[PDB]
Design a protein around this ligand. Structure first.
Ligand SMILES: CCCCCCCCO[C@@H]1O[C@H](CO)[C@@H](O)[C@H](O)[C@H]1O
Ligand SMILES: CCCCCCCCO[C@@H]1O[C@H](CO)[C@@H](O)[C@H](O)[C@H]1O
Lengths: 149, 48
């Protein structure tokens, strides 16, 4: 999946590992670590979520109590829009014949959270479904790709 | 000696035209497809 991303997007933010480079991890600093939290963990860009035996009220309050630090300017109120990433039909092949099995990931550019079709696309994925050697249905499963597999 | 003469040259023309155009086209498609390889890049990244 990582490699998939790294070529699917290549030269874009999305083509980066969430764990970061080996170098970065080696040299990141008290500084930059600060900066991230600093620049990134900001109120508008956050959602306090809860579910269980709790009343919205009670909760909402506690939040009003600790989620202080009020924003002065207007920049601190502005949700930064991200520069979009270029999809690129391509491939990356990491060969190691010493690897027991092989993995293969194929994909196409998606529509994005918003777009409704994401629903359809899912309904689709539901038809091709999924499979591992332990499913019991085996040869009787409904996913054509499964059965054949 | 060669009644055809004319018609044969008239053909040569047609043949040269189709020819030139169809070779060009094919050449694109050949390159196009082959691009994938000629553009290819590889690296040797062992585990060290
Ligand atoms: C030169 O002209 C040719 O004359 C022939 C008959 O003479 C025809 O059959 C060909 O079609 C024509 O191109
Ligand atoms: C590389 C492939 C080249 C094919 C060229 C096709 C040329 C055939 O063209 C011929 O020309 C004659 C003269 O007018 C006509 O009489 C024939 O009917 C016609 O078929």
């Amino acid at each position: 999946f990582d490699y998939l991303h790294a070529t699917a997007f290549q030269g874009t933010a999305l083509a980066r590992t969430v764990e970061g480079t080996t170098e970065n991890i080696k040299h990141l600093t008290r500084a930059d670590l600060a900066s991230y939290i600093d620049t990134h963990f900001k109120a508008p860009r956050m959602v306090l979520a809860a579910a269980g035996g709790i009343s919205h009220k009670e909760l909402v309050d506690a939040a009003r109590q600790h989620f202080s630090g009020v924003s002065f300017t207007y920049k601190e109120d502005a949700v930064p829009i991200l520069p979009r990433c270029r999809f690129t039909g391509s491939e990356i092949r990491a060969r190691d014949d010493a690897l027991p099995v092989a993995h293969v990931a194929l994909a196409v550019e998606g529509p994005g959270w918003a777009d409704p079709d994401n629903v359809v696309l899912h309904v689709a994925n539901a038809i091709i479904g999924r499979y591992d050697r332990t499913f019991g249905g085996g040869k009787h499963l409904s996913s054509r790709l499964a059965a054949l597999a | 000696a060669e009644p055809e003469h004319d018609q044969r040259k008239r053909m040569g023309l047609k043949m040269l035209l189709i020819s030139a155009l169809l070779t060009s086209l094919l050449y694109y498609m050949k390159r196009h497809k082959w691009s994938v390889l000629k553009s290819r890049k590889m690296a040797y990244r062992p585990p060290k």
